[PDB]
Structure formats: C-alpha cells, structure tokens
C-alpha cells in the first residue's frame, strides 16, 4: 500500500487514546484530592533516505495538573486540605513512601490513621492515635487527642503530620494514583522529602478534583473533528490504491 | 510447485488472507470477556517474512507464526465478576479497533494487487506459447 | 468497551451512585437520630502504555 494510511491510522488511534485519558479525567470529577492528567500530541518524524515526508503522531501525558481544586467545607475535624504546592505523605502499597492531596483521614478501631486505606506518615513513621479518641488537627499539622470521659483539659499533642513541598515538574503519578519523586528530582532532593515547616493545612475542608470542564469539552470536540479528518484520508488512500492496482493489469 | 511468479503471488495471497482473517477475528472479539480457559482474548498478529531459501534475496511472503500482543490488557473495575482478580479488576482485550479496520482495508488492497499480478503473469505466459506461431 | 465508552460509563455510574446517596440523605430528613451519608470516590489503577 501507500503507507500514508498508516499515518492517518496512527493519528486516529492516538486520538482515541487522548479521548480515553479525557474520559478518565471526567469520571473523576468528584474524586477528593484528584490531579487531572495532561494530554498532548507529539510528532515523531521518521528518519531515513529521501524526502522526509512522513511524521507520525503519538499521544503523551506530560505529568499532571497541580492547580488546587475546590475546597468543600465539611464540618469534620479529620478532613484537612493542604496549602497550594503542598502534599501529604502516606505509606504506599509496597511499603514505600508516597504523596497525596486527599485529606479524608480515617481512624481505625485500633487507632491508626489512614488515607484511602494507606497508613498516614507522621513525623516518625505511621501515626497511631489513642483508641476511640477525638482528634483535632492544627494549622501546621500537630494532632491533639481528647480521650472521651476525661475533661477537655486532657487535650495534648500526639504527633505531627508530615507535609512536604513539591512542584509538578518533580513528581510523577505512579500506577496506583500516588505521586512519587521523579528520578532527576529524587537524585537532587534525596530519597525522602524533608518536611517543610512553612506548609499550612486547613482542618474541616476537603479538596476536590481540579478537572476543568471547559477544557475537557473543547478537547472532546477537537478530538472528534480530528478523528473524522484522519478518517477522510484513510478513505482517500483506500480508493487511490484500489485504482492504482489497475496499472498491474495487461 | 507453482512455477515461479505463480508461487510468489500465491504465497502473497495466502499470507494476506491470513492477515485479514486475523484482523477480522480481532474485530469480532473486541468485547470478549473470557475464553474457554477463562483467559481474556489477546489480540493476534501475523508475522510476515520472506522465503528465499535456495540462495536468493527475494522469494515472496510467508507467515512465520501468529503471536499474541504484549500491549497491557485493559483493566475494568468489576468486583462481582467471577473472573475479577484480588483487586476486583477484569482483563479485557487490547484490540485497537481503528488499527484492525485499517489492516482489513490494506490487506484487501494488497490482496487485489497480487491478484492483478498473477492474472497479468498468466496472460504473458499464455502469449508466450504462441512464439513464432 | 473501546476504553472510552467504558471510562465514561464508569463516571456515569459513579455520579448515579452519588445521586442515590444524596436522595437517601434527603428522604431521611425527618427520621430521628439519622447520620448523613457522604460518598467517597477513588480512581482505579492507571495503565502505563510507554515509559518516560
């Protein structure tokens, strides 16, 4: 054939990949502490002899969007929201250290703090709270525990949440949705990120997802139009080859 | 066997028919959840390579093998499915629909081109027999 | 299941579940000692197609 069909076909398939990314972002429009994935087409030119006429296209996800989302006021002392450019630290699935923005902190029957089922990492390893005690979280992450039955004079600090500062260019979303330091950024900032004393959290507010609707809509419209365009070419090439095959006759 | 160009073009026709069959099978089973063994349907692909064993560089086309794609299978969340794993995820085929449609059309076009080649070669061989009346 | 009709179906189902939770909260306003429900969502495993 004329491999021009293999260019428009790639452009049509990567458009479906982009649509699958955008639809995934739209599905998580209500996920607490969600970071939308950025999608971008990139052109790769095929190198070789003769007129460099073929340039294929391949989707690309250049990190995520770090713009803070909405702050819903839920009058719950455990739901916290982070200052912009801030991250909470939890223990990842494989016993590693991961970063998140979901402040929906839950207390188990044994007293351990968890986020989405992952243990919360305190100044010194996971945080264990006295069993069945009221928890208040300060602006700088200090945790006060009140034991029921005892007077409010008993309120004393227990542990401090680890709050780190990381930009978009330094973190990469792992396969389980937890952000981790990129290789270059890890090599310069060390393996574990030191807690920043300047980070401020807000107790009683939960951060929503930063999925922008207007950009999503525009992206879907553009993707549909591009797919239809590539499909026109895929039809042009087909007919042209169908007719060109006649020269092989007589 | 098939003389020369006859063998070459017949090999090409058979290989392109196999490729189109693979593409049609992939298109049909793009939404299959399971197979007889309980494993997800993995997209199949043919392997084209030349067959010029008796000291030649060009000899036509033959399909060495049919191979299943290694592109990550699509995970869908479904905890009630008997085939779901520990996390509740079910594996679904990695078929590229647009890719298989383009494969169907391209296979048809090159199959037709080889048909035109074989027909022309027959014509020429038919005229040859009338060399000098 | 073209990987874009499944992803959006999942979002539609999630929004329907959230609406069911909201309707349950609103219907049980007059009950005694009722604690309101809140729906929490999490994204599933992201698939990596090609490494950076």
């Amino acid at each position: 054939m004329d491999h021009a069909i293999y260019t428009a076909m790639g452009a049509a398939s990567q458009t479906l990949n982009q649509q699958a990314v955008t639809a995934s972002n739209l599905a998580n429009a209500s996920t607490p502490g969600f970071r939308a994935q950025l999608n971008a087409l990139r052109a790769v030119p095929v190198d070789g002899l003769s007129l460099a006429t073929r340039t294929l296209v391949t989707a690309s996800t250049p990190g995520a969007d770090m713009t803070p989302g909405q702050l819903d006021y839920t009058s719950r002392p455990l739901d916290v929201a982070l200052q912009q450019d801030g991250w909470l630290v939890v223990q990842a699935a494989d016993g590693a250290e991961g970063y998140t923005r979901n402040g929906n902190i839950q207390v188990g029957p044994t007293g351990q703090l968890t986020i989405q089922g992952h243990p919360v990492i305190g100044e010194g390893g996971p945080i264990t709270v006295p069993e069945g005690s009221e928890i208040t979280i300060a602006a700088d992450g200090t945790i006060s525990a009140l034991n029921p039955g005892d007077p409010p004079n008993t309120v004393a600090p227990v542990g401090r949440l680890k709050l780190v500062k990381a930009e978009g260019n330094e973190v990469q979303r792992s396969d389980d949705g937890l952000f981790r330091l990129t290789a270059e950024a890890q090599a310069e900032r060390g393996a574990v990120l030191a807690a920043d004393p300047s980070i401020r959290i807000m107790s009683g507010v939960l951060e929503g997802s930063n999925v922008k609707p207007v950009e999503a809509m525009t992206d879907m419209i553009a993707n549909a139009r591009r797919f239809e365009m590539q499909m026109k070419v895929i039809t042009s090439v087909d007919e042209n080859e169908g007719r060109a095959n006649q020269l092989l006759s007589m | 066997a098939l003389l020369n160009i006859f063998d070459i073009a017949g090999s090409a026709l058979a290989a392109q028919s196999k490729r189109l069959n693979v593409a049609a099978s992939n298109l049909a089973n793009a939404d299959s959840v399971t197979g007889p063994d309980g494993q997800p349907y993995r997209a199949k692909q043919v392997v084209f390579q030349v067959d010029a064993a008796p000291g030649q560089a060009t000899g036509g086309v033959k399909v060495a093998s049919v191979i299943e794609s290694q592109a990550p299978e699509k995970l869908v969340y479904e905890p009630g499915n008997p085939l779901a794993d520990a996390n509740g995820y079910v594996k679904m085929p990695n078929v590229d629909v647009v890719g298989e449609m383009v494969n169907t059309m391209s296979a048809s076009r090159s199959y037709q081109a080889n048909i035109e080649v074989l027909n022309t070669v027959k014509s020429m061989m038919l005229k040859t027999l009338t060399l000098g009346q | 299941m073209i990987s874009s009709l499944w992803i959006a179906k999942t979002g539609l189902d999630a929004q329907q579940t959230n609406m069911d939770v909201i309707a349950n909260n609103l219907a049980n306003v007059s009950t005694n000692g009722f604690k309101r429900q809140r729906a929490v969502f999490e994204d599933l495993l992201y698939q990596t197609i090609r490494q950076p």
Binding site: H3 | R19, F48, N103 | -
Partner: peptide, 16 residues
C-alpha cells in the same frame, strides 16, 4: 528480518 506487519510495528515505542 521481519516482524508484525501492521499496527504493532508502525507505532512509536520506547527503546530496548
């Protein structure tokens, strides 16, 4: 000498 003739060889891939 050859490979998959179609979609799986005409798409960009990371190197090995």
């Amino acid at each position: 000498p050859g490979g998959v003739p179609g979609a799986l060889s005409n798409q960009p891939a990371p190197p090995n």
